[PDB]
């Protein structure tokens, strides 16, 4: 009847597993992320299987966002704050990518970024 | 005339440390600014777990901080955000909220704020019964706290529909805003972000439109230099897009700046140059204000 | 003759005026910032003798962005620098690569960077 | 045998605090690692202003830190980078260095390093006349400081040509590395980062070629998880691309990890796992993917 008290789901091992695949190595992307990219590249290569993939891709985007959500609400705020900018910026680019994929079927970054874009 | 001009630490992300806050006051005092609104979104004991009473070590820290605000001639406004899980009707909730603020009053705080921003617009079935609209519940508990706190000189209220692009159907005809305007006590001030969450411009007519329904001049919570929506961006530009012709039509301007405390020199200094330029109602040039700000800052590096 | 003692040059108001234009507002860049973004796009398109002076000026402009970080990184008060090191560090680097590009035209950011590179 | 395995705090940017440092030792110990190389580029007293002595509190905190290293059986190595503005031939300089390291010795330190990395190859007139090459000048002062400190157990030297793609005109034909290889005392260990600065792979073949010309097996200063070059990237991947077949052919592996102290759990964990997987190997054993599930499991508990 009343408003349920604020509580947060803790950090799952699968969260960390995804995190590590997102921020993997300097010469290689983590399996999950490498994949997460291939899919967005493909759904941007067509605009009419596709609708079933985009549904499963948006699921993945949600996982990224949820990962941040749980990562933040954890007891140890030291770990979080130490790499907040990274997790936040991945969470954000996933929202704008999810939102762009939802739109595809249903029809920023600073000055430093604008300079990076205009390069091979 | 009373005008609340200063800084609001009301962003998401890592909150500022006490020694930073103390330094903020020195900067605000130096630049003839007068207010500080304590609202860190990530302080557990402010938003998520608002019910929690302050610890003993935590209490000593706040007491010192409020003392610093007194010493530097800065009004310390303490904000609390219950909106997440509060049950408006249950008087045990309203009681716990009263107990919390009572503790804060013991630290030396005289100005308070009740915030109902970035919260689910849905009331629980229990509250749905007891109160007509969401605004009715919010106005009720606020007026109650205002009165219980002995009607402070400074009591700020933050509505959920805090900007134009959040008002359903629109600002002039929002049934939420009408409730606030009418039922919310004329003593209590209302926070506003302008036509948007990060307003590029704040047109005088937008402030005349919202004042109409809220039945008073709003206190601006400015997000011009706020960077908690893509931490990939830093904003060292000057306060710009707000007419000095707004100063007599507002009860204040509290800016929510960059999360990086050191980054806010130019944004606070330019806010000061803006307010100072026309306290009594082209008096201001962002480009000019910026140079002034930049020349002062240069001193901090040597 | 002996080896010159390490000396740090102080931050100038010019350094700070470049810094404020590089990281300006959420809705626009500082005049110096937009001016530099223009000059790179114009010099990119073209491949007269005017391009020599325009690429030479731009290489010097890029060099100030570099100098600015060196002098900011060298001042006694590290607190200010370190409180916004990430931001200043990036632009400095992107601007250093962009400096080499133009020199060569006369003879990064990770996974979130990769998805942000594919958005319109 | 003797193998140096741990973290080198040698990055650019905001260095680590003492609280963070004491924690690194606690973790280093738990995972059976043994060394910490103190080398933050951005410490004024460490590189730029190397001449400067540590004040009462500066001295107090280093003393504390060095005592914590002892307490957790972690070998602390104090590195110093004079190479920027130093005059090699001037003995006032040599004495300033001697005097500086003496102060550190008085804090408890018995392990030292001399670094000549990320510095221009050209010597001044005084040094140019006296010393035949830049290598000669470094070898001279390093050897002098080695003996001055009383030929300690662990003494580390960092070349300017510290990685493959930095050796002129190549690795085996480098006069710099040759001078070092011949004239630098055998007791002194040499730092190497592999083929590139941030090596994708460190092949056994490359460690043979460099081990030849320096007449000793190097101590790797690994940049696999370092993120100073791109503060918009962070590395949580497992230690990968270094054969367990390297452990017998090296004096040690020190990891230069992410600037962001807390994000180095997987990096230092998988490194410990790597080393330990072929500790006593003389001259597969390590799955990075398996090292990672182990690291991530142990990390998960820290969040709670
Ligand atoms: C009075 C309105 N309250 C708001 N709270 C949030 C703040 O925490 C953010 O810092 C701000 C900038 O992103 O945006 C909204 S506006
Ligand atoms: C032993 C070799 N010394 C080096 N000094 C620099 C370090 O300061 C950097 O942190 C590292 C990563 O960017 O790369 C080079 S390698």
Can you give B192-213 as a three-state secondary structure string? ECCCCCCCCCECHHHHHHHHHH
Total domains in chain C come to 1
DSSP state of B233: -
Specify whether the CB–CB gap between C35 and C53 falls below 8 A.
no
| Pairwise CB contact (< 8 Å): A100 & C112 | no
Helix (H) or strand (E) holding B37: strand B35-38
Q: What is the CATH number of the domain that holds B148?
A: 3.20.20.80
Structure tokens at B20: 């930073």
| Pairwise CB contact (< 8 Å): A115 & C109 | no
Nearest-angstrom CA–CA distance, B213 and B207: 10
Considering only alpha carbons, which residue of chain B is nearest residue C71? B301
Judged by phi (left if over 0) then psi (alpha if -120 to 50, else beta), residue B79 lies in beta
Q: Which residues of A touch C111 (CB under 8 A)?
A: 22-23, 29, 33, 37, 90
Total domains in chain B come to 1
Query: Known catalytic residues of D?
Result: 118
Question: Resolution limit in angstroms?
Answer: 3.1
The chains found to touch C (3+ Cβ pairs under 8 angstroms) are: A, B, D
Contacts of C114 (CB under 8 A, 6+ apart): A37
B114-128 as b/e, with b when 16 or more CB fall inside 10 Å?
bbbbebeeebbeebb
Determine the distance in angstroms separating the CA of B124 from the nearest CA of chain C, rounded to an integer.
37
B78 beta partners = B38, B112
| Pairwise CB contact (< 8 Å): D262 & A82 | yes
Structure tokens at B65: 């901080």
| Pairwise CB contact (< 8 Å): D124 & C1 | yes
Ligand 2 contacts CB of residue D166 (under 6 A)? no
Helix (H) or strand (E) holding B177: helix B175-183
DSSP state of A66: H
Structure tokens at B16: 């500022």
Nearest-angstrom CA–CA distance, B267 and B235: 8
Considering only alpha carbons, which residue of chain C is nearest residue A35? C111
Nearest-angstrom CA–CA distance, C19 and B265: 13
Domain containing C64 equals 1-120
Q: What is the largest CA-CA distance in chain A?
A: 58
Nearest-angstrom CA–CA distance, B281 and B243: 12
Neighbouring C-beta atoms of residue B81, cutoff 10 Å: 22
Contacts of D165 (CB under 8 A, 6+ apart): D195, D196, D197
Contacts of A36 (CB under 8 A, 6+ apart): A57, A60, A64
First to last CA, chain A: 58
Domain containing D57 equals 1-304
Helix (H, G, I), strand (E, B) or coil at D79: strand
Considering only alpha carbons, which residue of chain C is nearest residue B237? C24
DSSP state of D209: H
Nearest-angstrom CA–CA distance, C16 and D32: 48
Question: Where do we find the tokens 């996933």?
Answer: A94
Nearest CA residue ID for atom 4, ligand 2: D117
Cβ neighbourhood burial of D86 (10 Å; 0-12, 13-18, 19+): buried
Helix (H) or strand (E) holding B275: helix B265-276
Catalytic one among B42, B43, B102, B118? B118
Task: Return the closest-CA partner of residue C67 out of C19, C28, C112.
Answer: C19
Specify whether the CB–CB gap between B46 and B81 falls below 8 A.
yes
Residues written for chain A: 120
Specify whether the CB–CB gap between B260 and B14 falls below 8 A.
no
Nearest-angstrom CA–CA distance, A53 and A56: 5
Helix (H) or strand (E) holding A31: helix A31-43
Determine the distance in angstroms separating the CA of C12 from the nearest CA of chain A, rounded to an integer.
22
Nearest-angstrom CA–CA distance, B75 and B4: 9
Query: How many Cβ pairs closer than 8 A exist between chain C and D?
Result: 53
Q: Which residues of A touch C118 (CB under 8 A)?
A: 40-41, 44
């Amino acid at each position: 009847m009343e408003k349920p008290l604020y509580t947060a789901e803790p950090v799952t091992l699968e969260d960390l597993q995804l995190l590590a695949d997102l921020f993997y190595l300097p010469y290689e992307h983590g399996p999950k992320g490498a994949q997460m990219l291939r899919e967005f590249q493909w759904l941007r290569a067509n605009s009419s299987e596709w609708r079933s993939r985009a549904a499963k891709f948006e699921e993945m985007c949600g996982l990224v966002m949820g990962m941040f959500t749980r990562l933040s609400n954890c007891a140890n705020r030291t770990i979080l704050y130490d790499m907040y900018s990274y997790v936040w910026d991945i969470k954000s680019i996933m929202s704008m990518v999810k939102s762009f994929v939802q739109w595809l079927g249903c029809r920023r970054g600073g000055l430093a970024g604008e300079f990076q874009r205009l390069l091979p | 005339r009373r005008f609340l001009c200063g800084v609001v630490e009301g962003f998401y992300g890592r909150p500022w440390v006490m020694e930073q806050r103390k330094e903020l006051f020195r900067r605000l005092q130096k630049w003839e600014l007068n207010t500080y609104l304590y609202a860190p979104k990530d302080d557990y004991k402010h938003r998520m777990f608002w019910r929690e009473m302050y610890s003993v070590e935590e209490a000593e820290q706040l007491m010192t901080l409020i003392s610093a605000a007194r010493e530097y001639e800065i009004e310390f406004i303490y904000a609390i955000s219950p909106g997440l899980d509060i049950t408006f009707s249950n008087p045990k909730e309203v009681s716990t909220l009263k107990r919390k603020l009572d503790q804060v009053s013991q630290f030396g705080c005289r100005s308070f704020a009740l915030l109902f921003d970035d919260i689910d617009h849905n009331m629980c079935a229990a509250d749905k019964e007891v109160f007509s609209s969401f605004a009715h519940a919010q106005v009720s508990i606020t007026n109650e706290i205002y009165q219980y706190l002995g009607e402070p000189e400074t009591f700020l209220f933050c509505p959920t529909e805090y900007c134009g692009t959040f008002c359903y159907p629109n600002v002039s005809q929002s049934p939420y805003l009408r409730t606030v305007g009418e039922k919310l006590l004329p003593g209590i001030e209302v926070l506003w972000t302008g036509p948007k969450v990060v307003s590029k411009e704040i047109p005088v007519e937008s402030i005349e439109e919202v004042s109409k329904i809220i039945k008073r001049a709003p206190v601006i919570w400015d997000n011009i230099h706020a960077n908690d929506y893509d931490q990939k961006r830093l904003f060292l530009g000057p306060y710009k897009g707000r007419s000095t012709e707004l100063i007599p039509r507002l009860k204040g301007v509290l800016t929510n700046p960059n999360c990086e405390f050191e980054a806010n020199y130019v944004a606070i200094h330019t806010l000061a140059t803006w307010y100072k330029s026309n306290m009594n109602g082209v008096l201001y040039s962002p480009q000019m204000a910026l140079k002034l700000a930049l020349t002062e800052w240069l001193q901090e590096f040597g």
